[model samples]
Each structure stands twice: as C-alpha cells, then as structure tokens.
Target chain A: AFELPNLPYGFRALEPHIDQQTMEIHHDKHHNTYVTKLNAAVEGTDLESKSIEEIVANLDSVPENIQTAVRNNGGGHLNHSLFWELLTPNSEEKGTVVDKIKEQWGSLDAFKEEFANQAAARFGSGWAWLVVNDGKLEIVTTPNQDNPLTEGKTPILGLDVWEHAYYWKYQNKRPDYISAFWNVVNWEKVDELYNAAK
Target chain B: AFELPNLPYGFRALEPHIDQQTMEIHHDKHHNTYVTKLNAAVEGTDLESKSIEEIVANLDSVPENIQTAVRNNGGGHLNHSLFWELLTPNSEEKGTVVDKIKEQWGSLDAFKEEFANQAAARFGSGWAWLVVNDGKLEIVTTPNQDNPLTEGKTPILGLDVWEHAYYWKYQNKRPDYISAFWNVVNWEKVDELYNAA
Candidate 1:
C-alpha cells in the first residue's frame, strides 16, 4: 500500500501568509486521510501498482466499488502535493505571470480580479485552477476533488477552495483566503510549471 | 428567509461532548449561512413567505434556478435547527427507539454500530439518520443537504456529518465525531420527535 508523504518544508514555513496550525492540520490530518484511504481503495488491485497520476488519469479502470475513493482521495493526494510545492512563502516572475495575464485578460490586476472571483465563486468544496488547455492559459474551477488532468488538460497552478484549507483562519470569507494566496505563491514555481505544461 | 434560531441550550452546555469552538462555528458560521442563503434563494419569490418546513416540503414551488438553493440552504437551515434542538450535551427510548432497535437489530449496541458504520461509510459531506418508517426504525444516509422531509419520511434523529460539523475537532476521523455525538444527543428529544411524528 502507498503511504502519506511528508511536506517538503516546515509546516510553519508559510507563516503569517498561512498559519502553522492550518498547515499542520491540513498536511498531517487532511492530506494523510487522502493517502491512507487511497491505499485502502487500491489494495489488492492492479491500480495499486500504478503511480498516483496514472490512477487519476485511468480512473475508468478502478473497480466500481473503490472508484469514488480513488477519485476523491487520489485526486486529493495529488492536489495537495502540487499545492504545497507551489507555496514558498515568497515570488520572482511577475514578468511571466503578468505578461501572460495581460496577453489574455488585459492586465495583471484583471487576472487577479478574475482569479479571485473564480476562487470565491466556487461554491462548496473545490479547487480553482490556472491551466494550459488547448495551448492557452486559462482559469477554471471544478468541484470536489476534480483536477484538470481528468479533462486531459495540464494544470500549472491550483488554489484549494475546500473549507479545511482556510476555515481556521479566514472562516467563511474564502475571498480573503484566496487573496492571501497571492502573497505566498511561489510564482517561480508557476512559471516553471507553466513553461513545462506548455 | 427565516432567521437562525437560538440553540436550545448554551453552546458550552454541550462542551466536553461537542466543544465550544466547533459548536460556535457550526452555529454561528455554518448554520447561519443556511439561514442567510435560504433567505437569498426565497426573497421576492412565492417561497419567501412560507415556513422553512413549507419551503422544504414544497420545493417544486421554488424557481428552478433557485430550486437547488432552497433545497440545500433550506434543508440546511431546518436540519441544523432541528439538530441543535436535539442535542443536550447528554444521552432514551421505550415506545420506539428502545423497542424498535432491540427488536430489529437485536440490541442497542448492534443498532449503534450499524448506525455508525453506515454514517462512516457515507462518502463526503452529508448526514446519517435514524427514522421511523413503516412503523420501524431504520438507518439511512443522504448526500449534500438532503433530509428525510424531502423523501416523505419522518426524521426521528439526525447526525450532521458535514465536514463543517466536526472538522474543527475530529478532522479526518468522522467516525469518531459520529460516535462522540451520542454523548451530547438528547434521546429525550428523540422520543419527543418520535411521538410528534
């Protein structure tokens, strides 16, 4: 069976941008649940030998009994892994993120506005993605453990809207939590992911 | 369109069982969203004037665009209000809960285990219920803000397993929170719900 992975950085590394309590609980509790249950779902199955991404991409192969578990937990496991890597408590690529935004939506502020809007408007538990789809950079939202991968697109950046991500600090004001994400996002990672996905 | 009703007892009254923090957030933040949004869904519509139960019962009357809103928020509003009233930071029943479980499930322990197993087995945000149907108590689950009211069944007792209900304290171990809720459940209230229904 697969195991829960460790966060690359200290839980408090993102500090005031993302509180240590949220980080600890989110990583130790929430992320672990995905990993633990994902293992349980795939146990004794052919999918057990595949990488997490393969399981996600080939969801059709999962036995119906464990399909939902693999979908939610496997997607959750991958989502949190990418989510943590892209947060560095710090940024250096406004040239990359900003220039792309201006080309698509008009200006950096416009993209931020639109990004925050999609992130805020996503009702219930979900994620907001910045993806390279059809050779275009786009912002989209999907509910409950869905990622761009299932649609055959590449997601360069994702903002988790699940309440557990921000409920401890931001409460019901998800918009504020979305706004705070900008402060800690490692744009270097985004541009790298963008350059690679494309 | 209705205001959030006060909890039957002080938030701390459920302490040690429910905890002040989770209760405060569930009541003030989570439950209030249901009240506030249910108002948004029904305002300036025919559904606006009806009681929460009426709105929930006659969901077809709600505009299709807002039908889901009323079902979710209205159900949320009623479910949470009913949930709060049935909790007393305690622990029931002769007429129905006691005899029914003892008869069908063999004993209360078997009944509770079945209840908790189904509750835990329910994947993602929802509720676990014990209801009297066909004059027998049965265990059932519903996803995303559905309740027995919508199905023409009577909800004798409800346990909200929505992450918002227990994530503050239990996080991933929903089964534990489901188990712990029994400590605060008011079976006296369960009997009351049984008699009235």
Candidate 2:
C-alpha cells in the first residue's frame, strides 16, 4: 500500500508564504490520491509485484490501458517523495553544496534567477530542477511529473512550479512565490544528494 | 509597436481565483514584454509589415536569430489575445458549443472529465485544447505555445495550463487549478468562435 510521507516541517511551518490549509490538502488529498490509485491500477496485473524503479525503467512493457495512469501516478509518487527530501524549514546556509552552485552558475543568486526563469517560463504543468550532468550542475525543466532522475541525470534540487504548489498564498504572482522558496531550501540535503551521485 | 491590451473587466473581475496583482503583471509586464520585444525584433527587418496570420503562416522567412523569439513572443501574443477573449467572470449557465457532447463523449460531464484529464496528464510546458476536426469535437494537447490551428484542426476552446497561468494561485496541485477554470469559462465567446470557424 502507498503511504503518505511525513513532511519535515508542520503543514503550517512554511507559512506567511505557504499556508497550512494548502499544504494539508495538497499532501493528504492530492499526493495520497495518486498513491492509492497507482496501487489499485497495478494490482492483479503483470506489474503487480514490480518495484517502482523497475516499472519506471521498463515503461514500454506496461499495458496500454494503464500506461498513462502508471506514468502519471508513478511519476507523481516518485517526484513528490524527492520534493519532500530536498526542502526544509531551516537556515539559509548552503552547506557543502554552495560550491556546486558557484561552479556552474557563478553564485547562488544567479542559480536562483536562472532556475526561477526556467520555472516561471515553463508553459504548463512541470518542474524546474538543478541536476548534475557529468559532474556539472545544469538547469532543466520537465513536463508533467517527469524529473531529471527519469532521464538519468542526478537531481541536486528541484522546485515544483505547478500551480497547486503556490496558488492560494501567492495567487498569480508566481515570481514572488519562486523567490520565497529559497528561504526554505535545504542545502544540507542537497549536499548529501550531490555526494551520493558523485 | 505592439502594445498591451487593457483588461475588458476590472483587475478584480476574476476575483476569488485570479487576483488583481496577477492580472496587472501578466498583462502589463509578462504579456507586454513579449509584444514589445516581438515588435523590436521584427523592426528594420523584412518581416515588419506582415500581418499576424501571415507571420505565423510563413515562419520560414523570419530571421534565424529571431525565429524562436517570434515563435515564443508572437505565439504568446496570439495565445493571450485569444485567452483574454475566451474568459468571462460568470459562466454558471454556460453551455457547450457543439451539440455532439453526447454523441462524442456521451455527455458534457464526460467531455469535461476527459479534457481535464488531458490537461492534467500533459507532460510539460504545453496546452490542452478542444478542437473541431472534420466537424467533430476532439481533445488534444500541444507542447509550448503550439496551437491546434497549426495541426489543421479548428480550435474551439483552449486551456493554458502553463505554470505562469496558475502557479501563483494553485501551486503544485494543477488539478484543482484546472477545475476552477471551468467556473469562469465564457460559453458565448466559445459559441461565437465556433460559428465563425
């Protein structure tokens, strides 16, 4: 059975910017819905016992009827899990990950701008990410639940640019919302992700 | 020079879902930026006098450096023009343009579900559209500013699912955002568009 991953901070913790009501509904209702339906769709099928990684790796083998469901729900589950891991309600210190940002983007602010530009410019439902390609940091965006991990790049950090991630609090001023995300960034976790990938 | 069009309704007209601050920036800043740059890039060039349809029809003649700009900005201008026309503050009694919602999808509700599903399922920067193909309503999605008109279908309705359109209001939960758009749809405008096509 799919389970709701506990957020590192309380639902209201990211607030003044992100409200507790939005977080509670987004996490409990939306994210949990993906997990529940995904389990149901895969059960009693050839994909019943396959690991999430195995299923994703062999996307072509999944039946056509369930193809979109698995991709959508599976991608949702995987993406949100990683999303939770990359954020925090802690300090703004970059930890060891600051060097990676400096190397590729010249400075953390530049990185944030580029990432925000990509995030703001993304035309539809998708994500903006900082990924490590051949040990170099790169900025990329993927449509509809797709992430760098799916394409074989190591994700160092990500920002969910989808409307449900920001609407209630920011309400159409997405740039402000994107700028605010920096305050809650968890650089320590990014450092760990980078070390593991390296 | 291309200029931003004033909102037909007040900034607060789209209240409760879309707010005034967003409308100002989206129109005055974001959309205006595209129009100004688009006009600048085409000026002093062979393409300056071309009509919007002509420019879109013959994308090849546009200079190479500005091709992506024209496509992006020009497309943004075109899409937003239609988007502004397509929306209204009240649509509680709105009706579907085509008579075959039942013949095609079995019901209007089904059609809505399918459209919403397509919108939600799109992978990346793209649009969800309801197009009229050979006189039948069909559902489709396109990546980044591409319109169904380019694919030989008559677009009856379109939903801009871009993050910039809804992120400030809905965040990562796009489904809810899409659902809310239905509340503000302008059936009259859609009917007129369908009739003209």
Candidate 3:
C-alpha cells in the first residue's frame, strides 16, 4: 500500500504565499485521505504490490470495478507526492532546468505567463503542469487529480488549482495564488526531475 | 442583457446556516461575473434577443465560437436567478410538492438523503437538483454552471456544491453545507415552480 510521504519541510515552510493552515489541512487531511483510500482500493489486489506511478501509468490493466478508485485516489497520491516535492520554503538555484525553460518558452517570464494562464484557465478542480513530453518542455492542464504520467509525459512541476488548495487565502482570486506560487517553488528539485526524466 | 438579481431577503437572513459572508461574495462576485460575461457573449448576436432558457436549451444553434461562454455564463445567470428565488429565511409549508416527493422517495427524509449524497459525491464543481422530468420528480446533477433545462428537465430546486458556495464557512466539509441548506429552502416557491412546470 502506498503511504503519505512526509513534507520535506515544516508546514509553515511555504508561508504567506501558501498559508500554514492551508498546507496543514491540504497535506494532513486532504492528501492523507487520498493515501488511506488508495490503500483500501488496492488491498488484496495485484495493484497493492505495484508502485503508484505504475498503477496510474497503466490504469487500463487494473480491474474495471476498481479503475476509478485507483485513478482518483492513486492519481491523488502520486500527484500530491510530486506536488510536495516541487515546493520548498528555502531558496535554491534554478540549475539546468532554467536553460531548457528559456529555450522552449523563449524566456523564463514567458514560460511563467503561459503556465500561470493555463493554471488559472482550468475551469474546475485540477492541476496545471510543466511536463517533459518526449524531451520537449510543455505546459498542460489536467482535471481532478489526473497526472501527466497517464499521457506519457513526465511532470517536473505542477500547480494545484483546486479551490481547496487556495480558498482559505486567495478565495476567488486564483490568479493571485498562482502569482504567489513562484515564490515557494523548489527550482533545484525541478531541475533534478527534469534531468532524470530526460 | 442579463442582470444579477437582488436577493429577496437580507444576506444574513439565513444566519447560523449559510452565513452572510458566503452569500455576499457568492452573489456579488461570482454571480455578477457570470452576468457580465454572459452579456458580452451574447451582445450584438441573435442570441441577445433570446431568453436564457432558450439560449441554453438550444445551445447547438448558438455560434460555436461563443457557445461555451453562453453555456457557462448563460447557465450561470439562469441557475443563480432560480437559486436566489429558492431560498427564504422564513419557514413555509411544503405545499403540494411534498406529495410528489414523498410519493416518489417514500418520505421527506429519504429524499433529502438521496439529494445530499448526490451533492456531496459530485467530484469537482457542480449542482445537485430536484428536477421534474415529464412530470415525475427526479434528482440530477450538472457540472460547472450547467442547468437542467439543457437536459430537457425542469429544475424546481438546486443545491450549489461548488466550493465557492460554502468554502468560506464549511471549507472541506461540504456535507455540512448541504445539511444546512435544507433549513433555508423555500418550499413554497419550489411548489410554485413545480406546478408551473
């Protein structure tokens, strides 16, 4: 069974931008429930032995009765795991990922603009991702806990646009939350994921 | 042009249940945006002359470029308009609609259970509705500003499950919001709409 990964930093780590209360509830309550439910959905099944990434990547192989449960909760577990890793309270170097981002989007600011737009434009609960698709960097949005791995892309970075993610601090102003997300991003980790995916 | 309708009662009228803050922002900010955008979507187009129900019910006829905007915004305008009317601070008799509801669901409590379950289970953002289909009462749900009219059903009652509806007070406990909504429902108005439809 997949377990909820601990946050590398304290809940207060991403303060002001993503509030401590939001982080505590999001990680402890929301993400924890996903982990618990995913375990239940996979227990006594072959999926119980497979990694979350493997289960989500090959969702069709799972039983139809449990496919949705695995898809939602399994996707939730993997996505939130990546999400926690992508965030950091401490400052870090942009590393090699900056070069790839600049190359594809022309400049870092342009990349952020496109990424933020996609995040804001996602109509409901979902995420916007900066993923590597066949060695190319691309921006994409997926609805309701869906992961980039499902589409054969590797998500190096993602922004959760679910109302629960920012409703406490930002309310209806999702753009403001997206704007603030840049401050807490762990660029060094993103670089590592980007290089590994390549 | 479509306009945001004023609440029949004060924002705090349903206090201790829905809360005043949720009402103000939900109506003033969220509903207002839908109206403003819907107007822009239909302005100078043939659809501008049609009613919201007509526009949504025959969505395929609308220009493809503006169809989504109209569907989202137009549906928002209509649904919120009905929603405002369906809420009241004062209690009233269930009227004739109770007969149909109890007849179909066996009891009022049973109906509420089914309705609330549907409202809570809506995965993301949407509404759970008590709609009349061919004169039979049915509970339905539609996602993100969609109204029952588009599906050939007549909505007499609805509960907005969008996080924007109750996130200020209830936060992650959406079931609580659904539970509290029962207290402020305008049963008399529901009966009126039911009979008319």
Candidate 4:
C-alpha cells in the first residue's frame, strides 16, 4: 500500500556535491526498503488505508507491536520523500524561504550555520530539521528514522544525518557533507513546505 | 588521558571476513576520534586521572556537560578495545568460553545462532553483546555508542552492528557481516574477558 517515489532528478543531478552512486543506492535500496517494510507493517491493519500524514501524526494509535516498524519505516517513507524533493544542483538558488529564514534568524548564511551545526552535533543516525515547533519555524533533530512530525511538528525542510546518507564518500567526515549540502539545496521546496505549514 | 589500543594481529589478519582497509580506517580514523575526543573531554578534570574502566563505570560522576562525550568516546574506546582483541584468523577455534555458553544456552551452535540473531536484529547503529548480566551470560544490544557497561552490565563478547563496522565490505547487508563474525571470533579473548568480568 506504499510506494517509493521516484527522484525528481537523475541520481547524478546533484553530483560533485552528493555522489550519484550514493543517491542510486540511497534511493533504490534504502528508501525502497522503507516502502516495502512499511507496506508489510501496515498490510493487515486498518493503518493500511491511513495516509502517511495520518499515520505519522497518530502513531500512538498504531498497534504497539508494529508501532516501531511503522515509526521507522513510516518515518523513513515520509522523511525521504521530503529529502528527495529538497535537493538541487543549483546551490545558489533563491526563494521566499530564504527571506523567511532571514526574517526569522537574521540571514541565510546564519540559518545555514545553525542548521549545519545542529546536523553535525547529532551523535547518531538521525536528521536535523527546520520545522514548525511551538507554532514557529525552529531547528530540531530526531534519532533513527524519527522526525519532527512524530511530535506533532511540521518539517519545512530536513537534513538527514544518517551514515547511509554519506558513509560512502565522506565516510567519517559528516561535517564535509553538511557543508556541501548547502551547495545543492533547492530552497524553493522549503518555501513551498513553509507556506503549506503556515 | 586515553590511548588507542593496538590490534592483537595485523590489520589483514581476519581478511575475507574483515578487510584490511576497513580495519585500518575503523581503527585509525574512527577509533582514534573517540580516544582524542575522550581525552579532550576529561582533560583537567578528575576524570583525567581516572582509568578508562573508572570513567566508563562512574559516568554519572563525570561533569554532566561532557558526560555524553565520555559515554560515546569512552564506550567507543572500551568497546573497540575488546572488539579488536576478540577477532582472529582462526575464528573457528574453540575455547572454555564455549563451554560456559553451552552451559547457559545449551550448545555452541545455539550460542552462535543466538548471538548472530541478536546482532542482526539491531535496527540501526549499535552493538549486540554477549554480556554477564545478573551474573550470567545474556544477549544484549544498545544504541549509538552505548554498551551494557553503561547499565553496570559486563560484556563477555560483543558484535558491533554499526554500519561503519560492516558497510564498507557488505554495503547495506549487515547480516552478512554479523554471520561472518562467527568465522573470525577469537573466543580466547572472550574466555579471558569472561574470567575477568
């Protein structure tokens, strides 16, 4: 009952920033696992019909036994959907999301600094997010296939810090991946998500 | 105030099971980070004088600020120390630890299967341990640089389930690495640890 969404661009579209092989495996292998596993997790249950948003928001109501399967795979399914739509080869892009970040945090560079720092500071497999928390866009992170949505928050943008995201090229240098991510971010998606959340 | 312990054998000693480059990086780069970071976290503090064992055991007494550093790096320091010493080219060799495991769990094959299953079941990055909990061997797992020692449990033998431990060789297939671990296990070290812990 779940599907792995196709990447908006080729695996190499964000190349020289994010590698094509990484994207291929990440999309084909990792993200696909989430979809297949999420399908199996919800197949025999009422949750098979639940929207991804509904499943995420009302995770507490999922069967306690498969709650984790739903959480990891469901969260994986949703999080990667956002992740794919949020990247771009044109790093120097412009959007109203830049203005919102500047209006909220002072400047785009400043926002990048804060976001990158939070992403690097996470010690395990997780993601850093710019999300609607406490009714405002704020920086937060969640560990192991978790996301802001699990806590009734809306993610305007996300940065996956899981090792699978970069262990191939960056290996131990996650900080390098964090810096390169800015060069390939599609800010337009963030604005679109932000406007929807607002 | 911590040091990177040496591997008992050459980096290529467990080749075909564990590659040379992975051991080199896992030891030099990944393991060293924990040592360097742990030293920085404890420098100029009472923990500076404490042994690695001491720091790992009494993490609560560590400054709350750097407590996490100590836990990840300290646990990293200790876990890898045991890990490197517990692998061998002759993984199929036997030891008294097998007898103890048989006594507790029934047979050597049973112990191997149970350890492999537990290691494979860990979802993300962490470890599956054969530990002395309640004064008897038990299967255990912990998340993100955590270990049984954090809860006052003692690890007799452990299998690292972290992606870094196997990602280079097995790619996304971690179960392969966990199963291959049985082929390279140095049960002598496990027996030694069991005796000491």
Candidate 5:
C-alpha cells in the first residue's frame, strides 16, 4: 500500500521563504490524506502491489470505479514525494539542468520568468513543472495533484501552486511564494534527477 | 464595465463565525480581482453592455478569445455578488423557503444536512447550491466559478466551498466553516430569492 513520504528536511528548514505552519499542515494534513485514500483505493486489488509511478502512468488499467480515487490520490502521492525531495534550506544552482534551462530559454532569468508566469497564470489548485519530455526540457502544468509522469515525461522540478501550498504565508500573493521557492530549491537533487532522466 | 459590489454589512459583522481578515481579503482582494478581470474581458465588446446573467447564461455569444475570461471572471462576479448578499450577522430560519425545504427534504435539519454534505464533498474550488429547476428544488455543484444559471436553473442559495472562502479561519477543516456558515446565513434573503425565482 502507498505511504506518505517524510520530508527530506525539517518543517521549518525552508523558513522565511515557506513558513513552518504551511509545511506542517501541507505534509501532515494534505499529503497524508492522499496516502490514506490511495491505500484504501488499491486495497483488495492487484494495484495494491503496484508502484505509485506505475499506478499513475497507466491509469486506464485501474478499474473505473476506483480510477478517479487512484488518479487523485495516487497522483497526489507521487507528486508530493517528488516535491519534498526537490526542496532544501542549503542549496546551489549548479548543474547540467541549469545548462539545459539556459539552452532552452537563453538565460536562467528568462526561464524563471516563463515558469513563474505559468505558475501564477494557473487559475486553481495545481503544480507547475520542469520536465524532460521526449528527451527535451519543457515547462508544463497540471491541475489538482496530477504529475508529468502520467504523460510520458520525467519531472526534474515542480512548484506546487495549490493554495494550501502557500495560503498561510502568502495568501493572495502567490507570485511572492513562487519567487521565494528559489531560495530553498535543492539543485543537487535536480542535477541527480536530470542526470538520471538523461 | 462591471464593478465590485460593497458588502451590505461591515466585514467584522459576522465575527466568531468568520473573521475580519478573511472577509477583507476574500472581498477586497479575491472578489475584486474577478470584477476587474471581468471588466477587462468585456471592455468595448458587446458583452460590456450585457449583464453578467446574460453573459454566463449564454456563453456561446462571447467571442472565443475572451470566452474563458468571461466564464471565470463573469461567473466570479455574479457568484460573489450573490454570496455577499446572502450573508448577514442577523439571521432567522423561518420563511417559505424553509417551508419549501420541509416539503422537499422532510425537515429543516434534513435540508441543512444534505446541503452541508454537498458543500463538504465538493472536491476543489467550487460552490454547492440549492436551485429551482423545472419548478422543483434540487441540490447541485459547479466547479471553478461556474453558475447554475448556465444550466437553466435558478440558484436560490449558494455555499462557496472554495478554499479561499474559509482557509484563513478554518485551514484544512472545511466542515467547520460549513457549519459556521449557518450562523451568518440570511434566511430572509433566501426567502426573497426563492420567491423571485
């Protein structure tokens, strides 16, 4: 059965950028709900043994009755798992991922501009992603716990734009949260994810 | 161009049930954004002269380019306008609307339970409504700023289940917010709207 993954760093580790209260409620309350629901959805079924990735990437195979549960909860599990690993208080931006980003957008700032714009433009609860799609880096977004893997891409970095993700600290100013996310992003993890993806 | 309507009562009037900070942000910031965007979307277009009711009830007439803007912002404007009017610090539970509730759902408590369940079960940013359809009462929900009017129903009462509606006060405990909503619901307004519909 699926389980909620522990945050790589302490709840307050990303503090001054993302608040302690937001992190605790997000992981303990929000992400944990997905794991609990995902477990219930796959119980007494063959999917109980399937990996989170396998479940989300081939959602058509899940029975229609439980398909939506798996899609929302299963996707939530996988997305949050990656989201936790991608953040850290101590960070650096050096990586071929940065090279890939600059190559695509001509500059790091330009790449960030595009990403932040999309994150802000997303109207409701969702995540914005940097993914390797068809062996190329691209920006894409998905609504309500959806992940890039379901669409044949490898997510290198993700910015969760769900109101719960920042509502406590940022409230209506989501763009502020998006900017502060850079301060805590674990670039080392991004490099590892990028190299593995390549 | 559409303008944000001022709340009939001050923000702090619904205290203890809903907080002042939440009201200021939800109304001044969140609701106002929809009004501003809706105005921008319809500027100089025929929609500028049309009412929000007409725009949302017949979306196809809006040009394809601004259709989504109108749907989201126009719906936001109308829904929030109704939402603000339907709330007041002073409230009562007796009306023909309550009688209609008893007729349809057997009791006032049964009607509230059913309505609260729908409000809690709405998955994400959306609303739960008690509507009059074909002259019969029905419970319905819509996602992301959609209105019952679009589907040929008259919304007699609505509960905004969007996180912004209660996140500041209730956080992840949305059911608590739904319960507190009864403390401020203007049953008198419900009766008026129900009679009009």
Candidate 6:
C-alpha cells in the first residue's frame, strides 16, 4: 500500500492558522486510515494492483461491492496527497504562480476572490478546485469526494472546504480559513501542476 | 436581522473529534455570512417582513427578482441555523433523544451507521437527516440546501455532510469526519426537536 505523503513542512509550521495537533491527526490518523482502508478494500480483488490513475479511469468497471469504497478511499487518497503538495510554508513562493492565475482569472486578486467564493459557497461535503477544463483554467466545486479528474478535467489547484480541513483552526468560520490559505500556498508547485496539465 | 447563534460551548469543547476551529468558522463566517446575505437579499423586497416559516412555506409566491435569492440565501440561513441547533458537545447529556433513536432505528449504533452511510452516499451538495416520516425515523438525504421540511418530514437530527462542513479538517476523507461526529452529538436537543416537529 502507498504510504501517506509527508507534509512539506512540520505539522507546527502551519500554526496559528492550521494547528499542529490538527495536522498530526489529520495526516497520520485520517489520511493514513484512508490509505490503509483503500489497500484492504482493493486487496485480493481484480483491482489489487491497479495504479491510481487506472482505478480512476475505469471507475465504471469496478464491481458494485467495491465501487463506493474505491471512489471514497481512492479519491480521498488522491485528493489529500494532491492537497499536501499544493501547500507550503513559504509565502514568497506564492507569487511565482501569479502569471497563470492572472491568465485564467484576469488577476491574482480576482483569482483569490473567485476561488474563495467558490470554496465558501460549496454547500456540503465537497471540494473547490482550479482545474484545466477544455484546456482552460476553470473554477468548480464537486460534492463528496468527487474530483474534477472524474469529469475529464485536470486539477491544477484545490482548496478542501470540508470541515475537517479548517475546523480546528477556523471552526465554522470557513471564510477566514479560506482567506488564510493564501498565506501558505505553494505557488511554485501550482505553476508546475498547471504546466503539466496543459 | 436575526443574529447567528453562538456556539453553546467553547470552540474546543467538541474535540478531539470536531476541532474548535471548524465549528468556529462553520458557524461564525460560513453560517453567519449566509444569514447576513439572506437578510440583504430580502431587505427592501416584499419578502423581507415574512417569517422563515412563511417564506419557506410560500416559496413560489416570492417576487421574480428575489425568488432565487430567497431560495438560495434564505434557505442557507434557515438551514445553517437549524444545523447549529442540531448539534451538541456533550455525549453524557445526550438526553431522552436516545429513546427516540432506539424506537426509530432499533438501536443507537444502527442509527449512527445508517446516518453516516446516508450522509456519505449523498450524491451532491445536500444534507442527510434523521426525520420523522409517518412517525417513523427515516434516513433521508436532500440535494443542495434542501431539507425534509419541504417534503413534509419532521427533521430531528441532521448532518450537513457538505464539503464545506469538514473539508478543512477532514479533506476528501469524509468518512473520518462522519465517524467522529457521533462523539459530539447533542441528543437532548434532538429529542426536544423531534418532539416539537
């Protein structure tokens, strides 16, 4: 089974915003639990050794017994790993991704507002993402572990608006957490992700 | 404008399951924003003076310009407010709601599993609820901000299940968040709510 990805920085690195304890439990307990369950769910089945991409691409073919498990655990694994990669403790690095942000959203500020709005507006358990849809950057939200990848879009950046992500730090004040996420964004990686998607 | 209700307990009271930060934002910024926007959308409009029950009861009669706004913002305001009241931090004080839970679900564990399953299985933006359908506790999910109230069911307990509810703390791992919620359920209020409904 694939191991949980390590955070780019220590758990305490996101302090005052995202608490260290929340990070520890969120990653060690939460993310790892999904990986463990995912591996178990796929073990001895035809999907036992399939790559993440293969599993995602052939979702419809997955047997009924494991379909929901694959979607939930598989998607959780992919989404959380991607989320970890998209964050950093370095605020300066965030500016480097501005060119693409401007290209898609007209300006960095616009991108921030639009992204935050979408994140906040998400009604229930879901994700807000910046994805390459039809070869252009688009902002969208998906409900309950659903990813843009399943809809044929390539995810470049994402904000997990699920309560677990920010509840420890921002509580029901999701907007504040959404607004604060800008401080830790890994813009350099976002640029690479955007380029790769293209 | 109706003020957003304060958390009945401190932010961290629900932990180590539901962290204080999530509850703070979910209530203060997210829920409060909906309430504020809902009031703005209704102000200077014919629907401004109507009670939440009246507004929701006569959704079709709202002015065309504000119809969708009322539905979205007003629905958001009402739903979140109800959501806040539905939860409690103390498991010991779960109250007489346990009896109702037993009567409706056969047992508490069964109710939790079914509730979590329904919440996890919901297809899109929606809510999962424990409602009274013909005097039986029925598990149901509503897409978007919809409620069982619209369908003539009396909602006793509900979980937002929306990504916004647990994304920051749980991310795409909704099951973990859902699993942890039972620890902090406010059964006393739910029992009272069930009776009222």
Return the clash pairs for model 4, or none. none
B164 Cα displacement, candidate 1 (Å): 2.9
| Candidate 1 lDDT by residue in tens digits, A19-110 | 99999988888888888888887888888778787778778877899898899999999888889888985555475766887889888778
lDDT of 1: 0.81
Candidate 4, residues B1-197: lDDT per residue as tens digits? 67898888899999899988789989999999999998888898878777787778778887899999899889899889888988988765567778887788788888778888778778777989988877787888888888787688988888877788887888888878887888898888888888888
Q: What is candidate 3's DockQ?
A: 0.65
Q: What is the DockQ of each candidate?
A: 0.38, 0.40, 0.65, 0.73, 0.66, 0.35
Q: Model 3: per-residue lDDT, tens digit, B71-99? A: 88888888889999999998564689877
Docking class of 3: medium
For residues B1-197, could you state the per-residue lDDT of candidate 2 as single tens digits?
56677778887788776756666767776678778868977887877777655576466667798887787777777677777777779765355574556667887788889999999877656778877788777899977776676666776677877766765666557789788777777777788777777
Which runs in model 5 stand beyond 4 Å of their true positions? none
Q: Any runs in candidate 4 off by more than 4 Å, and if so which?
A: none
Off by over 4 Å in 3: none
Question: Every model's Cα RMSD, please?
Answer: 2.5, 4.4, 1.6, 1.3, 1.6, 5.2
Q: Which stretch of 10 consecutive residues in model 2 chain B shows the poorest summed lDDT?
A: B92-101
TM-score of chain B of each: 0.92, 0.88, 0.97, 0.95, 0.98, 0.89
* Candidate 1 ranges with C-alpha deviation above 4 Å: A1-3, A93-97, B93-95, B132-136
Superposition-based RMSD of candidate 1 using all C-alpha atoms, in angstroms? 2.5
Residue-pair clash count for candidate 3: 0
lDDT of 4 by residue, A78-190 (tens): 99999999997765557777877889988988988999888988887899999987667789989888878778899988888988899888989999999989888888888
Model 2: DockQ vs. true structure: 0.40
On the 0 to 100 scale, the lDDT of residue A127 in model 6 is 86
**Model 6 spans with C-alpha error above 4 angstroms:** A15-17, A91-97, B1-34, B54-128, B134-136, B141-145, B157-197
User: Where does candidate 4 chain B have its weakest 10-residue lDDT segment?
Assistant: B90-99
Model 1 reaches what TM-score against the true structure? 0.90
Worst 10-residue lDDT window for candidate 2 chain A reads: A48-57
Clashing residue pairs in candidate 5 are none
lDDT of 1 at B121: 78
**What C-alpha lDDT do the candidate models reach, one value each?**
0.81, 0.76, 0.88, 0.86, 0.88, 0.77
Measured over the true interface residues after superposition, the C-alpha RMSD of each candidate is 2.1, 4.3, 1.3, 1.0, 1.1, 4.9
What TM-score would each prediction reach against the true structure?
0.90, 0.76, 0.96, 0.97, 0.96, 0.73
